[PDB]
C-alpha cells in the first residue's frame, strides 16, 4: 500500500511497456492510466516525486526524480503527454531489466547526493508501478534487479514498508497472471499485482491502493472515491443534528469545531442542551455524539415576515452555524468540506496566489448546467444540476404556478431571491423532508467544494412511509412541477466572514 | 488399493542406553493399516510386539526386546483416498526409559526414492522437483506453424534465459541425476553465462526417474531456464527440467526429400533469426 | 480470569526450533474436527521462494477427518533459503460443509556449521607486580566460519 | 559483560583483591542413527491423481 | 434458490421471498440457512394455511 502521511517523501517510479507486445491502443490505455494515477496522487497536496520511464529493448527516461521539477503536477503531466509509441521502433523487445536498472541508477544517484547517512534519505519511501504484460524476453531475470533494489535500501523485515512494487496490466492484451504475480512485491495482507479491462476499474483499484488513515491534519474535501467503501467514508463531512432522539437536519463540517446548517431547523428551540450532533466515527457505525456550545442564527431569517403581502413562507437568510463543545479529531471518517472564498479552496483548485472569489464563482459555476451532489437520508449520494444564466430565469417562473400556498403573482424578485439555485428539473432528484442543511457540493480535481445547502422545495418524494430508502417519483402530470431551491453560499459571504474570520482565512 | 509394510529394528549400540523401544511409524498420505494383522501379531505365543495402536495413518508398536540382528515384522494397509503428491513418509523409534534417545528414518513409496531430488553442488543446492521434459521430435513428425512452434516458445509463453546448440559426447550418472557432457558449437542466447563460447564444455542434468535420453554423437539444440549450480571447474550447470526446448538438429541425411526440406527451411530460419536477433515480439 | 478460546475445526502446526539449511525435514500439520458431522477437506502448502517442495508446490492432498477426530498430513520439505521463510498451510472444505482454516508460521533457518565456545580461565592477584598488567592472546583456530 | 572485539586485548588491574577472570569466546565452527536403528520397506501398488510426471 | 447474505454485527437482515399458493390446506414453508465458519446450520420450517 502506498502510504500517505505528512512526514517523509514518496518517490514514484512509473514504468510503461513500450514494446511490440503492446499495440498503440494499449499504449494509449497505459498513458491515460498513468495520467490518472499522477493526477490523483497530487490531490492530497503531499511531498511527492514522480519519475516516468517508458521502457523497451533499451530504457528511455522521460523525466528524472533527481530533477527539481518532479514536484510540479503540470510539468509531469506535460512530460507524460509528450510520450511517443514509435520512439522504440529500432528495438521492440520487452526489457524489464533495463527499466529496473534505470530505476536503480536513479536511486543510487539520489543516494550519493545528500548523503546516505542523512535522515532525509532514510525517511524516503519508494513505490514502483509497472504497467506491462510482464513478458520480458531479454535483458535478464527481474529477480536480480529486484534483489539489487532491496539491497540498496537494505529492505529487511523491519523496513518492509519502504518498497512497494506493483504490476498492473490494463487493457485487452493477454496477461500472464503468474508472471505479473511474480513481478509484484510479496506481502502478507495485500495484493500487489492486478489485471484489469479499462481505466475506471483501475481508478477503483488505485483508490484501494492507498491509505489516508495515517493522515490526520485538517484538510478539506479529501474523501474516499471507491464504490466498495462505507457511505460515511465517501462523505466524511456529513454530520447530523438530533434535537431529541430524532434524526431531523443534516449539516457539513467546515472546520475543526464548526458546522453549517439551515436556520429553519432551529425554529422553536433555544435550549441547546439535549441537542446532539452525530459525527462519524472510525470504530462505531452509529458515530460519536458531540455537544453544541453556541448556535448562531441569521438575524435576517423570518418565515412569516412577508405573510401579509401574500408570501406565506419566505426563506431569506436561511443559514445557521454550530460550534461543537469538543474538537473533532480528524480521521478517515470525518473531514471538513472546502468552502470557497478562502485560501484552502484556492490551493485545492491549483489556482494562482493572487486570486479573488469573483474568479472562484466563475471557475466553479461556469456551465449553464453544473453537476452537483447531495447526500440522501440513508447516506447515499444523488445527482442534481444547478442551473445559472438565462436558464435560471425559466426556473423561478414555475413557482408562480403554486398559487395555492402564496396566492399572489410571486415572480422571481418576490419569493425566489437571487440567493437560491435551481434544481429538480428533468432527470434530477429532490430531497425528502429531513435533508435540510445537507451540503450541495461538487467535485473538481478530486476535491469536494460546497456551493450551497438545501433550503426548500415544491415536492416531498418521501411522503409515502415505505422505508427510509424508498423514494417516490413525481408524476409527469403532477400539477406543480418539482422545483427545489438551495441557499447560495457566495451571496452570503458578508455574513460568513464576520462569524468565521478567525477560524478560516478568507480571500 | 492395498500395500504391505515391513518394520525392521535392531541395535548395535548395546554399550549405551538399552532396554525396550516404541516404534512409531507414519503410513502413507492416505493409507490406514489393518487391525487384524497387528492383532494376529500381538496375540501370538512368542509375541514379538507386546502392544499396538492403529489410527488412520499412525501406527504405534511397543517392542519389549530390541535385538542386535535384523528382525522384521510386517503387516498390511488399505487405501482410503488417492495420494495427491509423491512424498516420502517418516518412521521414528524412541527409547522407552529415555525418549530423548530416538532414531528417525525416512522411507519412500514402493517405487520412488526416500529423499526429495535436489541438485546440490558446494554452496548452491538448487531444487530439481517437478516434471521432467519430453523429447519432442517436431522435425521428424509432420507439423507446421507461422513462426510459432519455436519462436513463440522462446518469446511469447515461456521466456528461455539460455539457448545453445550442443553435441553430445559422453553419458554418465551421478547419484539420482543422469549427466550429459556436451560441447557448445555456437551460442544462440545467454544472459548470465557470458563466458560460454564455441568449443566449450557444459553439463546437462536430468532426473533418472523418467525416459529422457540423449544419444551420443548426435547434435542437439538446448533451450530453457538458467540454473544456479556450478560445475567442478567453476562453470554454470543447467538442469533439463520441464518447459525446456530440446530438439535434435537434423543432419540433412533424412531431409533432402522434398517434404521435409520445407520444415528444415523453417528450422534454419528460426536458428538464424534467433541467433542474430534478440527475441523480438 | 481464565479465558479459553476454541475453533471447533482448525489446523495445528508445530515447527522445530531451527533446522539446518539443505537438510530435509517433515511438516506434520494436524486437522482437528470437533464438529458433529463427518467431513472431507483438501490441504496444501503455499509455495514460496527458498523451499523445495515435492511435486512442484501447487499440489494439494485430499484427506478426510471423521467426526470428533484428528488426521495428520505429512509434507516433506528441504529448506534451501538463506535466513528464514514464512510457510502457510491452507485447508479448504466443501460447499456442503463450508469449513476451513489457514495457518502461516515463520520457519527459522540457523547458520551453517556449529557453535564452538572457548574458555580462557585467568588468575588475578594485584598484590604482586606480575599481576598488575596482563595480556590475553587471540584465537588462531582456522575452523572459524 | 558482553562485548565484541578483534583478536588482541590487554588487562590493566588496580585494587587489592584476589579474583578470577574468565574470557569466553563463542563463534561458528565448521561441522545415520548411532545406536538404535529402524528401517521400513513398502511393497504393493499405490494409485495417484494428477501427480504422474510422465507426459504422453 | 440460494442467496449469500452478510449480517452486520448486533443487527439483523431480512430476506424477502414471493410465493403464490395454487393449492388449499396446510403446506410447509422451509428455509435452510448455513453459516460460514460457525458450523451453525439452523433452518426453520413453518406451516402456512
Amino acid at each position: 500500500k502506498i502510504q500517505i502521511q505528512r512526514s517523509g517523501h514518496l518517490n514514484l517510479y512509473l514504468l510503461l511497456d513500450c514494446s511490440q507486445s503492446v499495440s498503440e491502443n494499449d499504449f494509449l490505455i497505459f498513458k491515460e492510466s498513468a495520467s490518472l494515477m499522477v493526477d490523483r496522487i497530487f490531490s492530497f497536496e503531499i511531498n511527492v516525486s514522480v519519475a516516468i520511464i517508458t521502457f523497451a529493448s533499451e530504457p528511455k527516461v522521460l523525466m528524472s526524480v533527481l530533477n527539481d521539477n518532479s514536484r510540479d503536477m503540470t510539468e509531469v503531466i506535460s512530460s507524460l503527454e509528450n510520450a511517443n509509441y514509435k520512439d522504440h521502433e529500432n528495438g521492440t523487445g520487452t526489457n524489464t531489466y533495463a527499466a529496473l536498472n534505470s530505476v536503480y541508477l536513479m536511486m543510487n544517484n539520489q543516494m550519493r547526493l545528500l548523503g546516505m547517512e542523512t535522515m532525509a534519505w532514510q525517511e524516503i519511501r519508494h513505490a514502483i508501478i509497472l504497467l506491462t504484460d510482464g513478458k520480458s524476453n531479454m535483458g535478464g531475470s527481474p529477480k536480480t534487479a529486484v534483489d539489487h533494489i532491496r539491497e540498496i535500501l537494505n529492505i529487511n523485515q523491519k523496513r518492509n514498508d519502504y518498497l512497494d512494487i506493483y504490476a498492473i496490466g490494463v487493457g485487452k492484451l493477454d496477461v500472464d497472471w503468474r508472471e505479473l504475480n511474480e513481478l509484484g512485491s510479496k506481502k502478507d495482507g495485500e495484493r500487489h499485482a492486478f489485471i484489469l479491462q479499462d481505466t475506471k476499474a483501475l481508478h477503483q483499484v488505485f483508490e484501494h491502493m492507498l491509505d489516508v488513515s495515517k493522515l490526520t491534519d485538517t484538510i478539506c474535501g479529501v474523501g474516499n472515491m471507491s464504490a466498495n467503501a462505507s457511505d460515511q467514508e465517501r462523505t466524511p463531512w456529513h454530520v447530523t443534528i438530533k434535537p431529541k432522539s430524532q434524526e431531523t437536519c443534516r449539516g457539513a463540517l467546515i472546520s475543526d469545531q464548526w458546522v453549517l446548517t439551515a436556520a429553519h431547523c432551529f425554529r422553536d428551540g433555544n435550549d441547546h442542551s439535549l441537542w446532539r450532533v452525530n459525527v462519524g466515527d472510525p470504530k462505531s457505525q452509529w458515530g460519536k455524539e458531540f455537544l453544541i456550545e453556541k448556535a448562531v442564527i441569521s438575524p435576517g431569517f423570518d418565515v412569516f415576515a412577508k405573510k401579509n403581502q401574500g408570501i406565506l413562507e419566505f426563506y431569506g437568510d436561511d443559514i445557521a452555524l454550530l460550534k461543537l463543545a469538543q474538537k473533532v479529531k480528524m480521521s478517515t471518517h470525518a473531514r471538513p468540506i472546502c468552502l470557497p472564498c478562502t485560501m484552502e479552496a484556492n490551493l485545492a483548485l491549483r489556482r494562482p496566489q493572487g486570486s479573488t472569489c469573483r474568479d472562484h464563482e466563475n471557475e466553479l459555476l461556469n456551465k449553464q448546467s453544473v453537476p452537483a451532489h447531495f447526500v440522501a437520508l440513508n447516506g447515499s449520494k444523488l445527482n442534481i444540476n444547478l442551473k445559472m444564466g438565462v436558464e435560471w430565469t425559466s426556473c423561478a417562473e414555475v413557482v408562480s404556478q403554486e398559487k395555492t400556498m402564496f396566492p399572489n403573482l410571486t415572480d422571481v424578485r418576490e419569493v425566489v431571491t437571487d440567493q437560491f439555485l435551481c434544481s429538480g428539473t428533468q432527470e434530477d432528484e429532490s430531497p425528502c423532508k429531513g435533508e435540510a442543511g445537507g451540503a450541495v457540493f461538487l467535485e473538481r480535481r478530486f476535491r469536494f467544494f460546497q456551493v450551497g445547502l438545501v433550503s426548500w422545495g415544491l415536492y416531498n418524494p418521501c411522503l409515502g412511509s415505505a422505508d427510509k430508502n424508498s423514494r417516490k417519483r413525481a408524476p409527469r402530470s403532477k400539477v406543480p412541477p418539482p422545483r427545489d431551491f438551495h441557499i447560495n453560499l457566495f451571496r452570503m459571504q458578508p455574513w460568513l466572514r464576520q462569524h468565521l474570520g478567525d477560524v478560516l482565512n478568507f480571500l | 488399493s492395498r500395500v504391505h509394510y515391513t518394520v525392521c529394528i535392531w541395535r548395535n549400540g548395546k554399550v549405551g542406553l538399552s532396554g525396550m523401544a516404541i516404534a512409531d511409524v507414519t503410513l502413507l498420505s492416505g493409507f490406514h493399516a489393518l487391525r487384524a494383522d497387528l492383532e494376529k501379531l500381538t496375540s501370538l505365543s512368542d509375541r514379538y510386539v507386546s502392544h499396538f495402536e492403529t489410527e488412520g495413518p499412525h501406527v504405534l508398536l511397543y517392542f519389549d526386546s530390541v535385538p542386535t540382528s535384523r528382525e522384521c515384522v510386517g503387516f498390511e494397509a488399505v487405501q482410503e483416498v488417492p495420494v495427491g503428491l509423491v512424498q516420502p513418509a517418516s518412521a521414528t523409534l524412541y527409547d522407552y526409559y529415555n525418549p530423548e534417545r530416538r532414531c528417525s528414518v525416512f522411507y519412500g513409496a514402493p517405487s520412488k526414492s526416500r529423499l526429495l531430488a535436489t541438485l546440490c553442488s558446494a554452496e548452491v543446492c538448487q531444487c530439481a522437483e517437478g516434471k521432467c521434459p519430453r523429447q519432442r521430435r517436431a522435425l521428424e513428425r509432420g507439423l507446421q506453424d507461422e513462426d510459432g512452434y519455436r519462436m513463440k516458445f522462446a518469446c511469447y509463453y515461456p521466456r528461455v534465459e539460455y539457448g545453445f546448440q550442443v553435441k553430445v559426447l559422453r553419458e554418465d550418472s551421478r547419484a539420482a541425476f543422469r549427466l550429459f557432457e556436451t560441447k557448445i558449437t555456437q551460442v544462440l542466447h545467454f544472459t548470465k553465462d557470458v563466458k560460454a563460447a564455441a568449443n566449450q564444455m557444459r553439463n546437462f542434468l536430468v532426473r533418472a526417474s523418467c525416459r529422457l535420453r540423449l544419444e551420443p554423437g548426435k547434435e542437439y539444440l538446448i533451450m530453457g531456464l538458467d540454473g544456479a549450480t556450478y560445475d567442478l571447474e567453476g562453470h554454470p550447470q543447467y538442469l533439463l527440467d520441464s518447459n525446456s526446448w530440446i530438439e535434435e538438429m537434423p543432419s540433412e541425411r533424412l531431409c533432402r526429400s522434398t517434404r521435409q526440406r520445407a520444415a528444415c527451411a523453417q528450422l534454419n530460419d528460426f536458428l538464424q533469426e534467433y541467433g542474430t536477433q534478440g527475441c523480438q515480439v | 480470569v481464565q479465558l479459553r478460546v476454541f475453533r471447533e475445526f482448525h489446523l495445528h502446526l508445530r515447527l522445530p526450533m531451527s533446522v539446518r539449511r539443505f537438510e530435509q525435514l517433515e511438516l506434520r500439520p494436524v486437522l482437528y474436527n470437533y464438529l458433529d458431522k463427518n467431513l472431507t477437506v483438501s490441504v496444501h502448502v503455499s509455495p514460496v521462494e527458498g523451499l523445495c517442495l515435492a511435486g512442484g508446490g501447487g499440489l494439494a492432498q485430499q484427506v478426510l477427518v471423521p467426526a470428533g477426530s484428528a488426521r495428520p498430513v505429512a509434507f516433506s520439505v528441504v529448506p534451501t533459503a538463506a535466513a528464514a521463510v514464512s510457510l502457510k498451510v491452507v485447508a479448504r472444505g466443501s460447499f456442503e460443509f463450508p469449513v476451513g482454516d489457514a495457518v502461516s508460521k515463520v520457519l527459522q533457518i540457523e547458520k551453517e556449521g556449529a557453535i564452538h565456545r572457548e574458555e580462557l580461565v585467568y588468575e588475578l592477584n594485584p598484590l604482586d607486580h606480575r599481576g598488575r598488567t596482563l595480556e590475553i592472546p587471540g584465537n588462531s583456530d582456522p575452523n572459524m566460519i | 559483560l558482553q562485548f565484541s572485539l578483534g583478536s588482541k586485548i590487554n588487562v590493566k588491574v588496580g585494587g587489592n583483591s584476589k579474583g578470577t577472570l574468565k574470557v569466553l569466546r563463542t563463534y561458528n565452527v565448521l561441522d545415520t542413527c548411532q545406536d538404535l536403528q529402524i528401517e521400513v520397506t513398502v511393497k504393493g501398488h499405490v494409485e495417484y491423481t494428477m501427480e504422474a510426471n510422465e507426459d504422453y | 434458490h440460494q442467496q449469500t447474505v452478510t449480517i452486520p454485527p448486533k443487527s439483523s437482515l431480512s430476506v424477502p421471498y414471493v410465493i403464490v399458493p395454487l393449492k388449499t390446506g396446510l403446506q410447509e414453508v422451509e428455509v435452510k440457512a448455513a453459516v460460514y465458519h460457525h458450523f451453525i446450520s439452523d433452518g426453520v420450517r413453518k406451516s402456512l394455511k
Binding site: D188 | - | Q62, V90, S94, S104, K105 | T49 | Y36
Partner: peptide
Amino acid sequence: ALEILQEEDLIDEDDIPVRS
C-alpha cells in the same frame, strides 16, 4: 483414485482468515 475426488467445488480459499 480409489475413492471420489471433489476438485474445484471447494471453498474460494480467499474468505478463509489467516492466523499468524
